From TrEMBL, chain A:
Keywords, sorted A to Z: ATP-binding, Calcium, Folate biosynthesis, Kinase, Magnesium, Metal-binding, Multifunctional enzyme, Nucleotide-binding, Transferase
Pathway(s) served: Cofactor biosynthesis; tetrahydrofolate biosynthesis; 7,8-dihydrofolate from 2-amino-4-hydroxy-6-hydroxymethyl-7,8-dihydropteridine diphosphate and 4-aminobenzoate: step 1/2; Cofactor biosynthesis; tetrahydrofolate biosynthesis; 2-amino-4-hydroxy-6-hydroxymethyl-7,8-dihydropteridine diphosphate from 7,8-dihydroneopterin triphosphate: step 4/4
GO biological process: folic acid biosynthetic process; tetrahydrofolate biosynthetic process
Organism: Plasmodium falciparum
Binding site for Ca(2+): 37, 41, 76
Residues the entry annotates as binding AMP 1: 151, 164-165, 207, 209-210, 212, 215
Protein name: 7,8-dihydro-6-hydroxymethylpterin pyrophosphokinase-dihydropteroate synthase
Length: 590, 548
């Protein structure tokens, strides 16, 4: 057929990825993402991950499968891109080539989809879901060939994974009765892959019964609209009454007006720090600060002490940190800048020792749940690479928001493995930043900036749910501006949020004059009071952060922060949510 | 004489309004008014909160010298505690009392003559700042409202825009006398029935002749000014006089929603509830004050150093206790004496008079408080038994001129039985009702409602989850001046998942409760760690402050 014509083509597909395994959602779904990157094209958009309920309310397999992967007949191009013309035109939505497969008209499509909806409704009369959408700049020719490959991808992994096609360019397709020859399937597969591997094919004939573009359930299932609203809010297919955002909002409002259900509440947005699910805005996590320079040189010393540094790492884990943020800068520890020690030499030994010391005192199989996520405050591609290659780190914390070296973004993807990234807003360096303070609209300039970085990383296949925002308190902000940023923190209610107020100069600015600091050298009695005040002022920001549902706070003082967060969590922990009005009523009757 | 100066002594119920213009001395003006009322009219058996009021559309050393040279009342003062007042119960019902000696009018005529006063005064105000308001119930020995108005006007002249006292009610009576002309010597004769006359009495009696033109019971504006209804709602919400549509509460509620419906303004916004710690106005729910804990155990000199440290670290109030073998007296009195010496020795800055902390004494011992009060050493009684241990202590909350404030805390048992007395049918409301009952008892005994502070007593006869539950439900006190002490208590540790470690976690858990208290607008918090608490409160205050 025209299906097999070897003239190279660039198509835009939109996929849905589903699983119901809570514990392994991330590994399952990220495995599927990578086989889609490998066997289909380039991932150029992702939604958040979502824990979904229906609208009314086995692992070692994978790790071994990655070695025995059949090669693609197309080479995957890791190169960074700034835009993508085909995607820009898919959104317009401008003139593309005619569909290879036969297209149905709007009316017939709708009727065919409605049939499937009512027929499946009757069957269900005779669960937690984990959902994610993706956009693929695809080299595959047509929706059906893609479905054949999708089916193969599924079978390589096998209800553990369900991959659907939601859109494929601007086409409207309904194909009724699909009889596929095991030899026609092979020719499609061999068109894209360097090919028992026959039982796989035999399973597929039964599987592809029909084909629907857009997918049947596209506007009917909230979870799909929910995902598509992150990626392509303004998009309008010929088959839909309105744009994706407009459809999504109507669903939310109608569910509210007609059934008195808040559909948002049952359908949770997820971010991923490492390998497990985190529910957006459901926990304030403590990130422990380990500054190697401060640990070593601030008392007057001239040598790095990796042991002392690793002692502090364990002290933080015990004090209640979930994440450790480790950083160094290239510094000259003598009077003359004559000899100096590199960032690599500051951070990698400490990371190496921590990893060694972890694998020892872990003697029981049980103490591995207690393993902190590891974040590295670096803008250096080489530092990050050695960390990632020797499995020393989980998260890139990039205070330039990946603008120092955008190639650092390539190191956030391996094959199977994805790493998470913090992007922070700043201007200049520590020497210049205090003067770089003019903003046309402080709150929204920083937000738009961070949003643009996200769009860039998302365009290059960094999964949306792995990107965290940091407003960079104290970095090119006057003290009143750091305060204004906190005042307007709600502006990040849709996003994973990572902040760092700890011990910054704007805290002292909140005090009018009208032991929590462990001393490195002897400061005066008057300076000790000021440090107490600052760490306490910080604990006030922890409280504020707690109530504002900030996802991650970066602190020097873990024990103190944890104490605060434990007490606020307890106060919020209520057994019976209406017992307040029930007890009140009982008193009124008494 | 005419049965107006009838020799028979009766007991009537009067409801008064007390108003002033001056914010700075409001408390003093009004409490001087209060004391003269206790002196000259009968017994105060109820009071409203103090209120800051904006009208419906959109120096003081004289007083201190006045209080020395007051004519004695011919009627007697009785400080014994009462449990009930039948005359007052009769007024509330409203059951049968003696016939009004003053000619009454019917509902129809009263309403006409009121509207008439309204329209004539609406016209002069159309031909043309802040008010401080308080109401009281007096069980009076004065025979009739006109006599009462005569004595009221004497009080007003003694104090002389400064003070304005009105009769809101006087039993069940309805009275509208249109043209009052009173002889100079009839005024003397009324005043002489109630007050042992002979300073400069002849000339003030001249002033009063001009002053009484008419008499309206109920007062013309009773139902027509928000500030009057606001006050009365505190005291007598279920009261229904013959001349009113419904009860005071209903009349209050209907005035509130009417301002919302017809004008889109929350009337509550510019009409603020006040409580008083020492001598100044505090706006309810507008500041979380820090109370520094001074626990005395053994040196006076070191303790007084700790006090000065706390003042500088930002404590508004110091709360001193010895009672948690030298006596409680011997622990706390010398410290408080030394403090007051040391404070007076630094008169090197004459302008620090409002830099002085309010002093609170944690005691249930009458003898200790008696010595504190006699020697002007304290401002506030912090009674952890809510004055149930020795209710005679309530007598010490009034000197002639002066009123003292009081914290009423809830507990059960003593420090050794406490932990076992933990059963409650309805924890949050049991404690609330208990504190309301205690408040009702002091208010009945003439303690200003606005000087009474509530403490849920965290950790006293509460399991840890109960202490938490009390915090979770702190909103229950949104109407009340609230004082809480969580600091270093055992339940803080209950929230968490080498020995200076637990000490740290406790202080920091305390700082979490400081944050919560701030957002829940708790009026006073009792802490060991003043600097730390102040740092939290300053930061949270900055974040809340939007300036343009
Ligand atoms: N129940 C009452 N209490 C006090 N004064 C009254 C009463 N009924 C009538 N009056 C008269 O109202 C007149 C005005 O009194 P004044 O201006 O001193 O205070 P007021 O107007 O009663 O106070 P407010 O402005 O709060 O109503 C006086 O001549 C007084 O005799
Ligand atoms: N756009 C589409 N994407 C994925 N599957 C589809 C689509 N249109 C039709 N199908 C069919 O839907 C059926 C049910 O799929 P599943 O629910 O994954 O078992 C299969 O027979 C698919 O061939
Ligand atoms: Ca009296
Ligand atoms: Mg499917
Ligand atoms: Mg008056």
């Amino acid at each position: 057929e025209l299906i097999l014509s070897e003239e190279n083509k660039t198509n835009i597909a939109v996929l849905n990825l589903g699983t119901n395994d809570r514990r392994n959602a991330v590994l399952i779904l990220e495995t599927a993402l990578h086989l889609v990157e490998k066997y289909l094209g380039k991932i150029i958009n992702t939604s958040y991950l979502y824990e979904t309920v229906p609208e009314y309310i086995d692992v070692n397999y994978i790790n071994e499968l990655m070695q025995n992967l059949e090669e693609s007949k197309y080479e995957e191009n890791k190169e960074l891109i700034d835009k993508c013309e085909e995607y820009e035109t898919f959104l317009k939505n401008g003139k593309v080539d005619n569909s290879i497969l036969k297209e149905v008209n709007v009316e017939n499509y709708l009727l065919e989809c409605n049939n499937i909806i009512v027929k499946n409704d009757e069957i269900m009369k005779n669960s937690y879901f984990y959902n994610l959408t993706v956009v693929v700049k695809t080299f595959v020719n047509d929706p059906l060939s893609m479905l054949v490959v999708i089916k193969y991808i599924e079978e390589l992994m096998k209800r553990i994974i369900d991959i659907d096609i939601l859109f494929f360019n601007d086409f409207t397709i309904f194909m009724k009765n699909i009889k596929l020859e095991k030899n026609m399937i092979y020719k499609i597969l061999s068109k894209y892959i360097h090919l028992d591997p026959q039982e796989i094919i035999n399973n597929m004939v039964d599987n592809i019964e029909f084909l629907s573009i857009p997918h049947v359930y596209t506007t009917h299932r909230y979870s799909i609209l929910l995902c598509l609203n992150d990626m392509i809010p303004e998009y309008k297919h010929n088959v839909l009454n309105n744009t994706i955002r407009c459809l999504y909002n109507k669903y939310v409002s109608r569910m509210k007006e007609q059934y008195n259900i808040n559909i948002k509440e049952n359908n949770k947005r997820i971010y991923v720090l490492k390998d497990r699910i985190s529910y957006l805005k459901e926990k304030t996590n403590i990130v422990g600060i380990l500054n190697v320079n401060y640990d070593s040189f601030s008392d007057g010393g001239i040598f790095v002490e990796p042991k002392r540094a690793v002692q502090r790492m364990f002290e933080m884990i015990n004090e209640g940190a979930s994440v450790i943020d480790i950083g160094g800068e290239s510094s000259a520890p003598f009077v003359i800048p004559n000899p100096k020690i590199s960032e690599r030499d500051l951070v990698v030994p400490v990371l190496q020792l921590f990893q060694k010391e972890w694998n020892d005192i872990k003697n029981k199989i049980v103490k591995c749940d207690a393993k902190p996520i590891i974040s590295i405050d670096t803008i250096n591609y080489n530092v990050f690479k050695e960390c990632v290659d020797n499995d020393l780190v989980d998260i890139l914390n990039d205070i330039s928001a990946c603008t120092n070296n955008p190639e650092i973004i390539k190191l956030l993807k391996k094959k199977n493995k994805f790493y998470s990234v913090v992007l922070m807003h700043k201007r200049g360096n520590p020497h210049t930043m205090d003067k770089l303070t003019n903003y046309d609209n402080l709150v929204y300039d920083i937000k738009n900036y961070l949003e643009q970085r996200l769009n860039f990383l998302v365009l290059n296949g960094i999964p949306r749910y792995r990107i965290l925002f940091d407003i960079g308190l104290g970095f090119a902000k006057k003290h009143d501006q750091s305060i204004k940023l906190l005042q307007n923190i709600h502006v990040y209610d849709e996003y994973p949020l990572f902040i760092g107020y700890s011990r910054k100069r704007f805290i002292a600015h909140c005090m009018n004059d009208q032991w929590m600091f462990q001393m490195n050298y002897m400061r005066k009695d008057k300076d000790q009071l000021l440090y107490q005040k600052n760490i306490c002022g910080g604990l006030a920001i922890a409280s504020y952060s707690y109530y504002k549902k900030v996802d991650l706070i970066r602190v020097h003082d873990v024990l103190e922060t944890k104490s605060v967060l434990d007490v606020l969590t307890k106060i919020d922990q209520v057994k019976d949510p209406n017992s307040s009005s029930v007890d009140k009523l009982a008193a009124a009757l008494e």
